[PDB]
Design a protein around this ligand. Sequence first.
Ligand SMILES: [Mg+2]
Lengths: 1321, 586, 49
Amino acid sequence: MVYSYTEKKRIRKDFGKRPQVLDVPYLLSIQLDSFQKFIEQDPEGQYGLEAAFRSVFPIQSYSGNSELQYVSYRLGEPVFDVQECQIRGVTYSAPLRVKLRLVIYEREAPEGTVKDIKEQEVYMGEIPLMTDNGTFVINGTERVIVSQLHRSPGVFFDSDKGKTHSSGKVLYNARIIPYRGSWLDFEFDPKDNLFVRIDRRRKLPATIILRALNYTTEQILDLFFEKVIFEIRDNKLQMELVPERLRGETASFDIEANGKVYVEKGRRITARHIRQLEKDDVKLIEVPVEYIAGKVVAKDYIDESTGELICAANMELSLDLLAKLSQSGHKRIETLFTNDLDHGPYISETLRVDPTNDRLSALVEIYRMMRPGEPPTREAAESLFENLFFSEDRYDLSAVGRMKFNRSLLREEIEGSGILSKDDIIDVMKKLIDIRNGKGEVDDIDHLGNRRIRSVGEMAENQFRVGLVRVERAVKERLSLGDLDTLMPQDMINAKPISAAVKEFFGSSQLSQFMDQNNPLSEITHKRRISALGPGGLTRERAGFEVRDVHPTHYGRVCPIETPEGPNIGLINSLSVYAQTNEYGFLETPYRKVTDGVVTDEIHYLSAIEEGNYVIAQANSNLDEEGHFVEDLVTCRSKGESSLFSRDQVDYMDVSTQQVVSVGASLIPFLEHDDANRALMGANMQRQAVPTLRADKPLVGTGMERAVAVDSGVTAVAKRGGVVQYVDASRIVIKVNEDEMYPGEAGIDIYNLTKYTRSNQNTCINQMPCVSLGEPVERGDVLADGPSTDLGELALGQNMRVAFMPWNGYNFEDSILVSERVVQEDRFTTIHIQELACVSRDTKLGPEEITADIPNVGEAALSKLDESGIVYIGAEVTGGDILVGKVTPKDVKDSSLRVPNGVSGTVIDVQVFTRDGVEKDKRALEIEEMQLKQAKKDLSEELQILEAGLFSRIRAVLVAGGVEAEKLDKLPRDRWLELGLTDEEKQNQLEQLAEQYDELKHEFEKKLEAKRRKITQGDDLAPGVLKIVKVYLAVKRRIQPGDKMAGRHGNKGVISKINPIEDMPYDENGTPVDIVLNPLGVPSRMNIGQILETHLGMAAKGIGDKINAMLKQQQEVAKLREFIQRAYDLGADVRQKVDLSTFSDEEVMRLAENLRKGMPIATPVFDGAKEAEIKELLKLGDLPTSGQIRLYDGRTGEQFERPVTVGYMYMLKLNHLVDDKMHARSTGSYSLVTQQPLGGKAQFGGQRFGEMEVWALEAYGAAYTLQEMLTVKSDDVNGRTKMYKNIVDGNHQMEPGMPESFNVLLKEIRSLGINIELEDE
Amino acid sequence: PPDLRPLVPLDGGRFATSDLNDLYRRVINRNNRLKRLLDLAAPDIIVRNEKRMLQEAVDALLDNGRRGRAITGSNKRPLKSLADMIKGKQGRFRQNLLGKRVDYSGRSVITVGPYLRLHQCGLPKKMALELFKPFIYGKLELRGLATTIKAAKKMVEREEAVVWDILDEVIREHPVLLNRAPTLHRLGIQAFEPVLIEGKAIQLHPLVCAAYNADFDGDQMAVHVPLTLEAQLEARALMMSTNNILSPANGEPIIVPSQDVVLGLYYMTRDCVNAKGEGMVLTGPKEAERLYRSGLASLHARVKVRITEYEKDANGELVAKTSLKDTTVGRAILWMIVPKGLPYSIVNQALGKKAISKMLNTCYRILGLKPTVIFADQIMYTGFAYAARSGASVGIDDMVIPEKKHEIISEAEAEVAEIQEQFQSGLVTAGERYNKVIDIWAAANDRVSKAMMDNLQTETVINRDGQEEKQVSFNSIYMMADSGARGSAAQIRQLAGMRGLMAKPDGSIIETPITANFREGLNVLQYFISTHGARKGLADTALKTANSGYLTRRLVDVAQDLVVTEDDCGTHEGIMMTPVIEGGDV
Amino acid sequence: RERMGHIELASPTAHIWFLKSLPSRIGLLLDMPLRDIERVLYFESYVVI
DNA sequence: CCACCACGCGGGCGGTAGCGTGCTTTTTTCGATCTTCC
DNA sequence: GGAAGATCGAAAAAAGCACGCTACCGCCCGCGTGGTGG
RNA sequence: UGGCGGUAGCGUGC
Ligand SMILES: [Mg+2]
């Protein structure tokens, strides 16, 4: 296998013996593809906008002469691209133009044929598009819509585990959850009765629903019961006996057939009697007349002579009723087969308790229950019942819902109508009755096969459909309201509802969250996130314990360790590395098919439901050549549990060892050696590391850094292969290869790197080139490294030298001791960019303007400000300085924006937004000039390349006409085109080339005109504001005590002291350690992964030091090749094979230069290097195998009594800086209602003394402290002023006064009509 | 009054209108409409409907949502009526009366300062300057440097050297109340003497950390400045850290070494077999220390030292007894920091965490409170210093895997297989075989843990002066596990022995346990099985914090008005307390 | 911050606190069911005096 | 004659109807039996 | 032999759901109706 | 520099 250009620079030593059968897929594939399904022009109406339009359109007005139909839809070209939308603060969206045809039918004609047709294109709002990185730009801010895990539509059966009714009896219930409609629930009463509820209302008998479905009592009994025939023979009432019906009952009489007494009176019926009956094949049997008395009739029986029914259906028989039936001429009757353990009489009891007796009465009762107050009637009740569950508009079972409904009911076909039917309800009732009887089993609510994933596309389609139905209601009203003589479809419909709905969904929804840009890992995790919250979902407070647990079905689909800790734990998850989504929304995971005991290469994607049927072997199974199993009794999992199985009983195998971990959790080396809690904390804290100014590759990694960096949009990848024509710190220009060329194309790719642009977390986004001039590149190769990325590899922290030992208690439990070298080498300084926005509005007294002269200010204050009233770019400012000078009329008062107190830095970017129709200041002119210069530079490069090509063509044409080499070389470049030639085809081709050249010049001139018009176009603003000035402040924050740092194994701490370099312990060679950590945190936290990572990093740094030492001595390339080959060949049957004989003897030098800082090591998430491999790698270098050396105390000097564990560990700097948390207040602003100090550091508020603190003070007995902190510090205004004056005067005395909050409460209670007052007496 | 329902002036000319104003406007409009319709002599139904609507509006204003549909807001939210903002957590009572934001307060992260004393806490210079601004202003005015408040403010802002000197002077003995966010009990807030430091992080005394339940992993704590003589004296006398050494809940001491002091004291007070300098005779602890510092005698060497110990006499005096004791160099060195009254038997042992706590309790009981704080500070200093000198470290070779683990695992697997085949032959049912498998695996895990403990605690061998013998292990992991610094027996078992059986979230136990150590790798299946318990525990803690807080609040209220107001009632009644016995133990 | 106002209602209206908060003060004083109180209050049924 | 700006007065929203739907504990009321008698 | 007290479970309504802190986003009626300008 | 709702995060037996 041949390495790529970006990989040949620095090859990572990869451990692991399991071959890679399937590569990691695109991480951002769940989102992007989904939105594509929302945008793609579907030939059939089943997905997206086309499906919504086909569902809504066409529409017919109340009058028969009007119709409106939809033809096609098209998404327009966005006016601004992503960068312009982000910088200008506008929403990145595209127009939606729909072809609509309005048809006026011939009302005069009885058939209503077509009379007039008007076709047009109607604009129907803006659709926010999705960028290439799977994120949206709403109002200039990056937003991410997370997938929602909700209940799958269909029929679900469950039951309370005896909690209700306080006797342990289980009440079985079934629910029908539709995608769009009214929920229908059936429940079992404690008295064994069926009840039906609609939308969680008061319970009604289900027989009411059955009667409303036009079913009589006889039909209901036939459907829900099996008839037993009693025939009146000449004597003894011969009846057709089924032997199976005799199981589980007693012998009410002497069962004897054909003169054979099978059972005597009063003997229990055992299986011997039924098998005897089946063998003897007895159908008829004698039955006493009293035995029928306990039976229930099955159908109405009416006497022909009298014309009146002796007995109706469904009531218990009796001796007198039996005699009346016998004397009326009846000979055969039917009864219900009722058992107390197999076939309960639930339907009969429900019919008994049912008050209704006809379809009309049931419909009236249903209407009364659904719509109380309104007068019930036949028409309204019938219409409501038909539209509730049998109308395509009100009720809509989704395709996945219908599939689940069919699968649960064991139906063969999985495709059906989207509305309910009589058969569906009958089958649901039958299944519920069977479950109550004992047949079958209930479903699992937490099973991952019963939960659906809704991506951004589905919610967007739902919101667009809501807007569409609103608009179609409006158009239905308008068509009948108006007269069709001259109406136009452009003004016929309105786009405001759809635009408002989509804007609210994309900007003000619980799932359209503010995307976090701490590091690329955070963005990847946020995009690949699943939230159970949101509309139509679970609640954070009302969640419970079961929903937060790890179901066995989560294996390979949902990461078990990657989840937030706190209130919303278990409700938020991350997709696995290989997990994807079905066409029905269900999560599925890959597996390798196993045939004839060998593991094949074909990959099958299995869902949660179908995985249980098969037997799946775990990934950590040893395999020999050709795929056989070396061991017979391999461990597998059959149905939600793990057990041993024979080698021939396996069906599928795990694709990879990273199948169950997420993207974030797969970046932790030696994960198997880490505790679950510490692994969870480390995974959660990895995505909080701010990017350092100098990215450092991880010495110990998992090999997933490349995929994370490439899939994320932070880095600039090459779209087409070629060579780097011009590499610059701000832009890269590459020349594409002739193979990837296009007709009529210059063939130059220009990448404009984003430099020093603030992220959503006020961090710094910087891209630096990683290629040199003339370096060939290929498609997919990284050209520039994004933030916290090194040579295409994710780099969140730094490889810091660490030693595990207590040091005078400075580390103590979790604190971290940091050497002065870390500050000196500038290894942890971050860059933070902060916005400062000043708004020049239009007050009613006069329009405020930005000017360089401010009343009653010093000259030094405005010295930084230029003649335009805006601070100079690149000028360092501190707290209280003036940035932009704005004065508003009162004559004018100072309202200029000022730097907030405690904020410093340097101004690096100034942006000016001006409302259209307002003159632009010269600063905006300069900014527009710079943008025009950049665009003109790009277009001039393209134009010069094309002009060089055209002039080469005309030179060739001239040489064909006549060589004239000396004359051509002695002529100006532009004068070549006009040269004359003899009358022939050469002149014709020359003039055609001249025409092409001038056409190209005109085209590029008009392109430049369009670009300059776009950049100078005025942007819209809010009503009342005429100017906006935004200033960016850049601050370099250095490490200091109080900052929070952490590793990748959940080990976190705060810096306690910046120790001097000479104070830190040093080894024999005299090199001091950089970080000192307390070993006491290792045994308690189970996180042994950090120790193994430290040992591996020490081995890697030893290898790198040997390489650097060999490089310093100017050794020949042969020795370097041999050493690097030996280092790479180390291992135990590693899958990675690196051959240095094919590196052209020059790339070896670059590889050695890259590796001189240390050999990178890739440790898979569960196939990592063993301890023996680490010891062998340590032995390869000049380091002890034990991993511990003898350190010398820096301050004191002698050897430490015991060897200590030193090495190199990857340390991260979390986004919790002490300067951002430090806050203090003596006095300041107060609330205008309760007269209490404000809250928060931003508002310069004071700390809140809560109820717990008050209780603690009361327990201490400090009455005076509590009184002074309650009254004279917060509320008592006179008390506060007097106390301040006394302190200034040097007197420490106070006046308790009276808190204002109590007075406010008294006034509020008085406003409630209750007289409350203070009685002095 | 209008100010209780203010109109916030917003940018652009808009005004923020409170819900009370909207409800009042609705009521006024309805009343005016009713009056106008009554003037017009409307029919009975119209005036009745108007009166009903007025009544509904009045009810909504007084308490919205009590009856009928609640009046919605601008963005589909219920309006905040008069009674809505009175009750509840966000109501006036629980937001502005029981608790309130206060001035002269700050918040910052907390670090560890080993040099601080029990009554001292580090305070950053900037925070101290901000908090003590009025005091600095007053002192500056008194000194004559500033003749007005504006000049003092400018001088404080400019931060001259005189301002720093004044700030140092004003906080000489001015206590500050340091408090943590989860104030479960009265120990959550304590008074400390500030010591000026440069930085932005508050330095905390390690010994009080157990009282604060605070870890140095991003913790943030608040500081309040008492600003009157009564409050200052209450902080000095009642809430000072030196006065809080016994927990009011049970009486047990709270100032106990936790992680590093215990380890250092255990390492110092330990005896080897053939350590350097063994068998020497020393004239006192000073000679022992001078030997240890000079690198001429090991800290674990067994020697004989002549020491004098002071015993408290019956009348209250101290009598000195001089005798030769066989001990170690480390114990002799540590003996000097021990006060006179304590006997020598307290430090003549391994001196684990329990022994250190017992020694501190004995010192408090005998000597009192004034020497106790000094003894605790000296103990912490010595423990930190000797823990640093020891250089204890955790390595991959420290956690040893027993050589008999493989045989035990193999025989347990063979027994499980034979039980499974016997069940398959039909002799036993599913429940019996499941119970047998569970018992077999539990016995195997217990035997593995016992073998691990036997191989770790004392399997070390040492060559004495003439032959070989055994002693207590010096392994680092065992050193911190036995001394009680960190970890426990189960934790060491999980590190080195098998992880044992694991239970699914429902509650039942899984037949196949995790037979892999933490030192060795764990396959995917074992990790997935083990994740269930961690997830269950985390969810339990998350849903338990709120319940515990609610129960604590209810208990606090139910006993919020009980104080000691008498000395004796003369009652001849009481409870007949007896020792509690349940089953076969006390 | 202290001065209060007053609105003169055209017709008397009952206080919701003394009417809905169980037990109903008006209903307990008048010995009549709360449903009758709601019916008369919101103009559903006449009441004799 | 049409479109943008200011000003005052009601109130679920929008529609030729329906929208909801994963908690626990305590208190109140009511239909239905019941049951107990005068 | 029907009416009043018992009760009894079942259903409906009300109140609660830890403490501090940080950051971002959205909003702070709104719609008809008259005024006026192009 | 005034507040509500939503979202996410921090510290809370190791
Ligand atoms: Mg902590």
